């Protein structure tokens, strides 16, 4: 069927992790200058106040013992 002429006419017209690293950088007691390393001193009175703390290896030596195969902790 023949198209209406109007249709044809119309168409044509249209066409914080960053800071956490910074804190890790901040907590350094050791830096190198020249040929001589340098180490930070904490105050002696502070060390007296702090408790004696633990050794990590003694607990880990226990931990590998506590998780041993023979124990069958499972």
């Amino acid at each position: 069927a023949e198209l209406p002429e109007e249709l044809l006419k119309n168409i044509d017209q249209k066409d914080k992790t960053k800071k956490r690293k910074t804190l890790k950088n901040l907590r350094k007691d050791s830096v190198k200058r020249g040929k001589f390393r340098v180490q930070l001193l904490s105050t002696t009175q502070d060390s007296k106040t702090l408790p004696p703390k633990k050794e990590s290896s003694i607990i880990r030596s226990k931990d590998r013992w506590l998780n041993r195969k023979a124990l069958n902790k499972g």
């Binding site: 830096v31 200058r33 020249g34 040929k35 001589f36 390393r37 340098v38 180490q39 930070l40 001193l41 105050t43």
Partner: peptide
């Protein structure tokens, strides 16, 4: 014989550590 060893220098303040200079 010339010495070959680390020589750790000790400072109280972290700030003092930052500007530490071998000359000074």
């Amino acid at each position: 014989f010339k010495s070959s060893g680390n020589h750790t220098i000790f400072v109280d303040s972290r700030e003092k550590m930052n500007e530490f200079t071998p000359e000074k």
